[PDB]
């Protein structure tokens, strides 16, 4: 405890002294660059996209979102995005098929690992597809925390 | 002043600190995570061949 | 110094340009390039140059 | 059963445009139906 | 065994601050790399140096 | 007497919305004669805060 | 929030005692210090939790979800 | 860093429970109480630099 | 020549190589072999996280105003001396039309999507003998309507003409030539919510209007020369199906529409009540 | 789960209910057990049901 | 599951404990901070009368 450190009872931590929740959100939506056809919230498979990450996209669903209540590790993607351009010769040129991805998916932050809770989608100001998710984490006290 | 005289580097770490009266002065305690991220090359000699083989 | 510094060299007549490694297109990383500041200024320079010479 | 939208338990089972403004409600925000998949915890 | 000197003791009110160590631990060996100056990038979240 | 008052509406609505979202206290002309920290984001870590 | 289970200091189960400690103060008109004494919490590490725990759970509960 | 100290070398003992860890006597040259301060690590990469770091 | 590089492991060679990116290490590795290929990757997301040229064209846009570290008289001198190259480019006309359609779209409180679509529509043709002037009203209104319609925001020609009168004829010819130009280079149900918005009614009459419009569309009676009129009298018979006083005498000037057409639609649905009500 | 109360609260507050353990010596650790995944001879199973009646 | 109190406070039966020896301080394993009297300023142990003064 020298120089303001503290000794703290492990057993009180175990019983539940100073436990806490942690809520994080993310925001993403389709963008229109048209010739008005916009991006899509689909589930990117292997032969659709380019240079997509190793996030192991299995946690998503057919509508390109994750379900509430499942757990997520550090590198799991939560949102699926795909480039609607056109003009890029979008599945006929300067890429194989690998259809039209140029995948713009949003992975989770690289460290924390919570549980997906309360995902909603509603259109934005002008009318798009606009998504907010939320993930929830338990944060037990450890050595370095500051009181 | 921001790219020549001083700069970003590599091979570094940054945490917070706490006391310990079971380390003598030339020692420092490092988390296993940090020591798993950082590294340091060694050249393979006759002397260290087995140890490095095991460690690989 | 005549071999390195001359007052008639001290007036700009022919202007070097730097290659894109000095002034990289930042490649805006959503869909676009967002191509950068120095190249914008050089495009301005060459536009005013051709305007002056056609007017002349 | 795919979307919630409200205080109503309107299981919209949405494909596309089946009155996202759900019939018993008025809402148009479309909340999204916590999974049936089995989840694990750890009561350490 | 008994301690010699008797000590102070009692309840007291604390609160837990947000600066938690799990957001401040950070390390990098040979990561990503800036474009204009070809240096290690910034950002603890961005795995910087 | 009708068509221009709607773009007028855009101008004053855009101006107020911009000033409050940014904090610079002046119209969309790169903040002359203005102050910066005027419209901070509400702090919501704790009711007391 | 509910009352805690299990006083952090000591470990004795608390949480059975909560609504009892309430109705000791509703109809019995009893002083609360004697109420905890008659509830039977003679150490004070246990005593602090019942005496200081606030019940936010019903204030949460007065919404109408689903 | 202000004076000749606060770049000091150490030997490393790997410890669990992620945070740094150092002896209490060396605290005042670093000028660092444990109120939430943070240090920096710098791993040398070759034999010359390891040797001169250890010997100075 | 083509100058192109494809990565290939020089010790596996079994395919276009199945490699991966180790982004936190900035390296690429032959995943089947394990040897690194190239190192020190360049960032691909923090550059976007740091912070329209295509609509504005190849020439580069410049919003130039006044600064802070100079005198006000010198800012006025800057404003007077910055206007020396507003005639060399056709981009002056491009942002002139852009400013005009900005005024028109944001006066019509339209979305940014609609604004950019109209920008695209003007930029695509932008100069032809097929354009041939037309007072810039025909082409701007046509481009705005095409972009707003292809953003699936259908607006009425009466509202377009009330915003900008283009005498309903040159507007039509310009719409046809824009149609032909875009055809070479290559929604009535959506009108109802705006009118019930202008009348202030809940969702169930809207749903009833959609059902009645689709059903009367399915069978017969185009009945009216742009049957937006009978689409409106669908709402009229819905509100007669309910009991809220929204009298046709009010409705005619509420929607700038003929009351006789309302009564004719009332008659043609009087004899056709049979299959238009769901519950 | 549907309640206001959070899931890991439900877990943690479950974890602290004391249980009858007279006969604790009869069974063995999950650890040391010959089985896998909670046989009756190393563990016991509990079930909860609730309703907003 | 089985579990023991060493790795979690779930598995405790203990819940409290008490401990005392030489309530009269005859062994002199402590001496009392005070300002007038050790005897006056400290309360007597409950276990005093079990041994002679
Ligand atoms: Zn609803
Ligand atoms: Zn206690
Ligand atoms: Zn290989
Ligand atoms: Zn077993």
Domain boundaries, chain D: 2-44
Choose the catalytic residue: A4, A58, A62, A126.
Answer: A4
Which run of H or E residues covers position H53?
helix H47-55
- C-alpha span between I272 and I237 (Å, rounded): 11
- C-alpha span between J53 and J36 (Å, rounded): 38
SS3 state of residue B39: coil
Task: Return the DSSP state at H26.
Answer: G
- C-alpha span between F15 and F20 (Å, rounded): 9
Closest residue on chain I to D27 (Cα): I203
**Centroid of ligand 3 to alpha carbon of B56 (angstroms):** 19
Kindly provide the b/e burial profile for residues I225-240, where b requires at least 16 CB atoms within 10 angstroms of the residue's own CB. eebbbbbbbbbbbbbe
Active site residue A88: no
- C-alpha span between G45 and G14 (Å, rounded): 12
Any idea which residue has 């940090």 for tokens? B34
Please state, in angstroms and as integers, the Cα–Cα distance from residue I19 to each residue in A40, I49, I185, I243, following that order.
27, 27, 39, 69
Residue B18 touches partner A, C-beta closer than 8 Å: yes
Residues of chain D contacting residue J7, judged by C-beta atoms under 8 Å apart: 41
Longest CA pairwise span in chain I (Å) = 85
Which ligand sits closest to the CA of D12?
Answer: 1
Residue I103 touches partner F, C-beta closer than 8 Å: yes
> Helix/strand/coil (H, E, C) string of chain I?
CCCCCCCCCCCCCCCCCCEEEECCCCEEEECCCCCEEECCCECCCHHHHCCCHHHHCCCCCCCCCCCCCCCHHHHHHHHHHCCCCCCCCCHHHHHHHHHHHHHHHHHCCCCHHHHHHHHHHHHHHCCCCCCCCCCCHHHHHHHHHHHHHHCCCCCCHHHHHHHCCCCCCHHHHHHHHHHHHHHHHCCHHHCHHHHHHHHCCCHHHHHHHHHHHHHHHHHCCCCCCCCHHHHHHHHHHHHHHCCCCCCHHHHHHHCCCCHHHHHHHHHHHHCCCCCCCCC
Residues of chain C contacting residue I44, judged by C-beta atoms under 8 Å apart: 29
- C-alpha span between B37 and B35 (Å, rounded): 5
SS3 state of residue D9: strand
- C-alpha span between J8 and D39 (Å, rounded): 12
- C-alpha span between C26 and C14 (Å, rounded): 28
- C-alpha span between B44 and I222 (Å, rounded): 89
- C-alpha span between F25 and F39 (Å, rounded): 9
How far away is chain D from the Cα of I15, in angstroms, using its nearest Cα?
39
Q: I153, I194 in Cβ contact below 8 A? A: no
- C-alpha span between I16 and G31 (Å, rounded): 82
- C-alpha span between B11 and B9 (Å, rounded): 7
Closest CA to I16 of H48, A96, C3, K5: A96
Q: How many CA atoms lie within 13 A of G56 on its CB side?
A: 5
One-character DSSP codes across B13-25 = EE-B--B-TTS-T
**Centroid of ligand 2 to alpha carbon of A17 (angstroms):** 12
Closest residue on chain I to A110 (Cα): I24
Q: Residue I252's Cα: distance from chain center in Å?
A: 29
Q: I143, I134 in Cβ contact below 8 A? A: no
Known binding positions of A for Mg(2+):
4
Any idea which residue has 């320079």 for tokens? C45
CB-based contacts of C6, cutoff 8 Å, min separation 6: none
- C-alpha span between C37 and C17 (Å, rounded): 14
Bridging pattern class, strands B27-31 and H11-15: parallel
Nearest to J16 among G6, G61, G66 (CB): G6
User: Are residues D43 and J11, on separate chains, in Cβ contact within 8 Å?
Assistant: yes
Burial class (CB in 10 A: 0-12, 13-18, 19+), B1: exposed
Closest CA to A34 of A82, A92, A86: A86
Question: In this structure, what token pair is assigned to residue B54?
Answer: 């095991």
List the beta bridge partners of residue A77.
A107
- C-alpha span between K12 and K10 (Å, rounded): 6
Please state, in angstroms and as integers, the Cα–Cα distance from residue H28 to each residue in B8, B19, H9, following that order.
27, 12, 15
Chains B and J touch, contact meaning at least 3 pairs of CB atoms under 8 angstroms apart: no
Closest CA to D31 of D43, A140, I19, D1: D1
Question: In this structure, what token pair is assigned to residue J11?
Answer: 């877990």
User: Are residues K1 and J43, on separate chains, in Cβ contact within 8 Å?
Assistant: yes
| Mutual angle of helices I112-125 and I91-107, in 10-degree steps | 150
Q: A133, A78 in Cβ contact below 8 A? A: yes
Task: Give the neighbor-by-neighbor strand order of the sheet with I36-38.
Answer: I19-22, I27-30, I36-38
User: Are residues C30 and A104, on separate chains, in Cβ contact within 8 Å?
Assistant: yes
Question: How many Cβ atoms sit within 10 Å of the Cβ of residue J49?
Answer: 4
CB-based contacts of G24, cutoff 8 Å, min separation 6: G30, G32, G35, G38, G39
| Domain, as residue range, for A63 | 20-140
Please state, in angstroms and as integers, the Cα–Cα distance from residue H11 to each residue in B27, H4, H7, following that order.
5, 19, 14
User: Are residues A3 and B19, on separate chains, in Cβ contact within 8 Å?
Assistant: yes
CB-based contacts of B13, cutoff 8 Å, min separation 6: B30, B34, B37, B38, E26, E27, E28, H40, H41
Best of D3, D35, D39 to disrupt the A interface (most A CBs within 10 Å) is D35
List the beta bridge partners of residue A25.
A134
Residue A86 gets the label, from left (phi > 0), alpha (psi -120 to 50) or beta, of left
List the beta bridge partners of residue A134.
A25
User: Are residues H24 and A3, on separate chains, in Cβ contact within 8 Å?
Assistant: yes
- C-alpha span between I207 and I203 (Å, rounded): 6
Rounded-to-5 percentages of helix, strand, coil across chain C: 35, 0, 65
User: Are residues F29 and I65, on separate chains, in Cβ contact within 8 Å?
Assistant: yes
Question: How many Cβ atoms sit within 10 Å of the Cβ of residue G23?
Answer: 11
CB-based contacts of A57, cutoff 8 Å, min separation 6: A43, A44, A45, A77, A80, A105
- C-alpha span between I262 and I236 (Å, rounded): 8
Closest residue on chain B to H10 (Cα): B26
Q: F38, F31 in Cβ contact below 8 A? A: no
Using alpha carbons only, give the angle I156, I157, I159 rounded to the nearest 5 degrees: 70
Task: Give the neighbor-by-neighbor strand order of the sheet with H41-42.
Answer: E26-28, B12-14, H41-42
Chains J and I touch, contact meaning at least 3 pairs of CB atoms under 8 angstroms apart: no
Which ligand sits closest to the CA of G46?
Answer: 2
Closest CA to I152 of A109, G21, D17: D17
CB-based contacts of D2, cutoff 8 Å, min separation 6: D11, D12, D13, D14, D32, D33
**Centroid of ligand 2 to alpha carbon of G41 (angstroms):** 8
Q: Which CATH number among 3.50.50.60, 2.40.70.10, 2.20.28.30, 3.40.630.10 corresponds to the domain D2-44?
A: 2.20.28.30
The dihedrals phi and psi of D40, each to the nearest 5 degrees, come to -115, 145
Q: F35, F25 in Cβ contact below 8 A? A: yes
- C-alpha span between H26 and H10 (Å, rounded): 11
Q: Which CATH number belongs to the domain containing residue A24 in this structure? A: 2.40.50.150
Closest residue on chain A to J17 (Cα): A15
Task: Return the DSSP state at K9.
Answer: G
- C-alpha span between J43 and J30 (Å, rounded): 7
Pairs from I62-71 (Cβ < 8 Å, separation ≥ 24): I65/F29, I65/F30, I66/F29, I66/F30, I66/F32, I67/F30, I68/F31, I68/F32
Q: I89, I127 in Cβ contact below 8 A? A: no
Please state, in angstroms and as integers, the Cα–Cα distance from residue A122 to each residue in A27, A86, A105, A130, following that order.
12, 26, 19, 6
- C-alpha span between G21 and I186 (Å, rounded): 78
Question: How many Cβ atoms sit within 10 Å of the Cβ of residue F5?
Answer: 9
Q: F6, I107 in Cβ contact below 8 A? A: yes
Residue H25 gets the label, from left (phi > 0), alpha (psi -120 to 50) or beta, of alpha
Q: A133, A28 in Cβ contact below 8 A? A: no
Task: Return the DSSP state at F42.
Answer: P
- C-alpha span between A130 and K31 (Å, rounded): 72
Closest CA to I104 of I72, I64, I136, I59: I136
Q: How many CA atoms lie within 13 A of B34 on its CB side?
A: 29
Residue E5 touches partner H, C-beta closer than 8 Å: no
Please state, in angstroms and as integers, the Cα–Cα distance from residue H56 to each residue in A79, A89, A139, H3, I47, following that order.
53, 62, 42, 15, 41
Residues of chain D contacting residue I202, judged by C-beta atoms under 8 Å apart: 26
Can you list the positions of beta strands (E) in chain H? Answer: 11-15, 41-42
Question: In this structure, what token pair is assigned to residue E17?
Answer: 């601050």
How far away is chain B from the Cα of E14, in angstroms, using its nearest Cα?
20
Known binding positions of J:
33, 35, 39, 42
- C-alpha span between G12 and G49 (Å, rounded): 11
One-character DSSP codes across J4-19 = SS-HHHHHHHHTT---
Any idea which residue has 């189960």 for tokens? G13
The dihedrals phi and psi of A130, each to the nearest 5 degrees, come to -140, 125
One-character DSSP codes across chain A = -TTT-----HHHHHHTTT----EEEEEEE--B-SSS-B-B-----GGG-SS--SS-GGGB-TTS-BPTT-B--TT-EEE--B----SS-TTTSSS-SS-S-----EEPPSS---EE---EE---SSS--EEEEEEE------SS---
SS3 state of residue D17: coil
Quote the radius of gyration of chain K (alpha carbons, Å): 18
Question: In this structure, what token pair is assigned to residue F31?
Answer: 């903040």
- C-alpha span between H29 and K2 (Å, rounded): 50
Bridging pattern class, strands I27-30 and A106-107: unpaired
- C-alpha span between A108 and A113 (Å, rounded): 8
Q: I108, I100 in Cβ contact below 8 A? A: no
Question: In this structure, what token pair is assigned to residue I192?
Answer: 């109802």
Residues of chain E contacting residue K31, judged by C-beta atoms under 8 Å apart: 4
**Centroid of ligand 4 to alpha carbon of D41 (angstroms):** 20
Q: B12, H43 in Cβ contact below 8 A? A: yes
Ordered structural domains, chain G, with CATH: 1-66 (1.10.10.60)
Question: How many Cβ atoms sit within 10 Å of the Cβ of residue H48?
Answer: 9
Residues of chain G contacting residue D7, judged by C-beta atoms under 8 Å apart: 64-66
Question: In this structure, what token pair is assigned to residue D35?
Answer: 């999974």
Please state, in angstroms and as integers, the Cα–Cα distance from residue A36 to each residue in C28, C32, C56, I86, I186, following that order.
21, 17, 46, 31, 13
- C-alpha span between A40 and A19 (Å, rounded): 39
- C-alpha span between I51 and I48 (Å, rounded): 6
Please state, in angstroms and as integers, the Cα–Cα distance from residue H12 to each residue in A141, B25, B30, F9, following that order.
26, 11, 7, 67
Ion ligand 3 contact residues with beta carbon within 5 A: I 9, 12, 30, 33
- C-alpha span between G37 and G35 (Å, rounded): 5
Tell me which residues of chain B have a C-beta less than 8 Å from any C-beta of chain H.
9, 11-21, 23-35, 38-41
Which run of H or E residues covers position B53?
helix B49-55
Closest residue on chain E to H18 (Cα): E25
């Amino acid at each position: 405890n020298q120089e303001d450190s503290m000794i703290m009872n492990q057993s009180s931590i175990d019983r539940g002294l100073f436990r806490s929740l942690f809520f994080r959100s993310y925001m993403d939506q389709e963008k229109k660059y048209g010739m008005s056809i916009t991006e899509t919230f689909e589930k990117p498979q292997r032969t659709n996209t380019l240079r997509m990450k190793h996030g192991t996209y299995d946690k998503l669903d057919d509508d390109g979102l994750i379900a509430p209540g499942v757990r997520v590790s550090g590198e799991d993607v939560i949102i699926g995005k795909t480039t609607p351009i056109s003009p890029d010769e979008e599945e006929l040129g300067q890429r194989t098929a690998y259809h039209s991805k140029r995948d713009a998916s949003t992975p989770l932050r690289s460290t924390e690992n919570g549980i997906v809770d309360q995902v909603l989608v509603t259109t934005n100001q002008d009318g798009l597809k606009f998504v907010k998710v939320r993930v929830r984490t338990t944060k037990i006290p450890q050595i370095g925390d500051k009181f | 002043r921001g790219n020549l005289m001083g700069k970003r580097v590599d091979f570094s770490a940054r945490t917070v600190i706490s006391g310990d009266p079971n380390l003598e002065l030339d020692q420092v305690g490092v988390p296993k995570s940090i020591a798993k991220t950082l590294t340091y090359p060694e050249v393979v000699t006759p002397y260290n061949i087995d140890r490095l083989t095991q460690l690989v | 110094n005549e071999v390195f510094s001359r007052p008639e060299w001290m007036i700009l007549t022919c202007l070097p340009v730097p290659p894109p490694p000095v002034r990289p297109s930042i490649s805006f990383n959503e869909s676009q390039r967002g191509e950068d500041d120095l190249t914008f200024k050089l495009a301005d320079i060459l536009k005013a140059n051709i305007s002056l010479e056609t007017l002349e | 059963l795919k979307y919630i939208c409200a205080e109503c338990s309107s299981k919209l089972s949405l494909s596309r445009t089946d009155a996202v403004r759900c019939k018993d409600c008025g809402h148009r925000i479309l909340l999204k139906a916590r999974t049936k998949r089995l989840v694990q915890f750890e009561a350490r | 065994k008994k301690l010699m000197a008797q000590i102070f003791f009692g309840p007291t009110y604390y609160q837990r601050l947000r600066h938690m160590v799990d957001d401040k631990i950070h390390a990098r060996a040979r990561g990503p790399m800036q474009v204009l100056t070809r240096q290690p990038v910034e950002g603890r979240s961005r795995d910087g140096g | 007497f009708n068509m221009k008052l709607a773009i007028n509406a855009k101008t004053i609505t855009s101006g107020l919305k911009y000033a409050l979202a940014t904090g610079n206290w002046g119209e969309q002309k790169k903040a002359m004669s203005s102050r910066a920290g005027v419209s901070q984001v509400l702090n919501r870590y704790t009711y007391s805060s | 929030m509910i009352v805690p289970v299990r006083c952090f200091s000591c470990g004795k189960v608390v949480g059975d005692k909560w609504e009892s400690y309430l109705n000791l103060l509703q109809e019995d008109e009893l002083d609360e210090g004697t109420a905890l004494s008659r509830l039977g919490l003679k150490r004070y590490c246990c005593r602090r939790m019942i005496l200081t725990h606030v019940d936010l759970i019903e204030k949460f509960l007065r919404y109408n979800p689903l | 860093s202000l004076h000749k100290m606060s770049m000091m070398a150490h030997r490393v003992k790997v410890i669990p429970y992620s945070t740094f860890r150092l002896n209490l006597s060396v605290t005042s040259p670093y000028n660092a109480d444990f109120d939430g301060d943070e240090m920096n690590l710098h791993v040398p990469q070759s034999e010359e630099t390891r040797a001169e770091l250890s010997q100075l | 020549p083509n100058l192109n590089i494809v990565l290939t492991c020089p010790e596996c060679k079994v395919y276009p190589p199945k490699i991966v990116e180790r982004f936190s290490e900035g390296d690429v590795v032959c995943a089947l072999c394990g040897l690194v290929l190239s190192d020190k990757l360049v960032d691909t997301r923090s550059e976007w996280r740091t912070f329209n040229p295509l609509l504005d064209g190849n020439n580069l846009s410049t919003r130039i105003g006044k600064g802070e570290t100079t005198d006000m008289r010198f800012t006025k001198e800057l404003n007077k001396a910055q206007g020396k190259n507003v005639m060399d480019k056709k981009d002056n006309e491009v942002q002139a039309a852009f400013a005009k359609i900005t005024m028109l779209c944001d006066a019509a409180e339209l979305p940014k999507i609609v604004k950019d679509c109209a920008k695209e529509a003007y930029k695509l043709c932008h100069d032809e003998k097929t354009l041939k002037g037309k007072s810039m009203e025909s082409i701007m209104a046509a481009s705005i309507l095409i972009g707003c319609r292809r953003a699936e925001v259908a607006r009425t020609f009466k509202e377009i003409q009330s915003l900008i009168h283009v005498k309903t004829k040159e507007f039509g010819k310009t719409l046809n030539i824009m149609k032909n130009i875009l055809r070479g280079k290559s929604q009535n149900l959506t009108y109802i919510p705006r009118f019930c918005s202008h009348l202030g009614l809940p969702m169930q009459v809207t749903t009833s209007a959609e059902y009645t419009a689709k059903k009367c569309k399915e069978i017969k009676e185009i009945a009216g020369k742009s049957p937006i009129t009978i689409a409106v009298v669908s709402i009229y018979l819905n509100i007669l199906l309910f009991q809220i006083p929204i009298t046709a005498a009010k409705v005619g000037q509420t929607l700038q529409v003929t009351e006789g057409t309302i009564k004719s639609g009332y008659k043609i649905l009087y004899e056709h009540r049979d299959k238009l009500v769901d519950p | 789960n549907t309640t206001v109360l959070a899931d890991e609260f439900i877990a943690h507050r479950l974890g602290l209910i004391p249980l009858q353990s007279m006969d604790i010596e009869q069974l063995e650790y999950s650890r040391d057990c010959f089985c896998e995944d909670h046989c009756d001879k190393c563990s016991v199973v509990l079930t909860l049901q609730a309703f907003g009646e | 599951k089985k579990g023991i109190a060493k790795e979690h406070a779930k598995w405790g039966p203990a819940a409290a404990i008490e401990f005392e020896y030489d309530p009269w301080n005859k062994l002199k394993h402590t001496d009392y901070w005070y300002e007038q009297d050790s005897a006056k300023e400290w309360p007597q142990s409950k276990n005093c009368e079990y041994e002679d003064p």
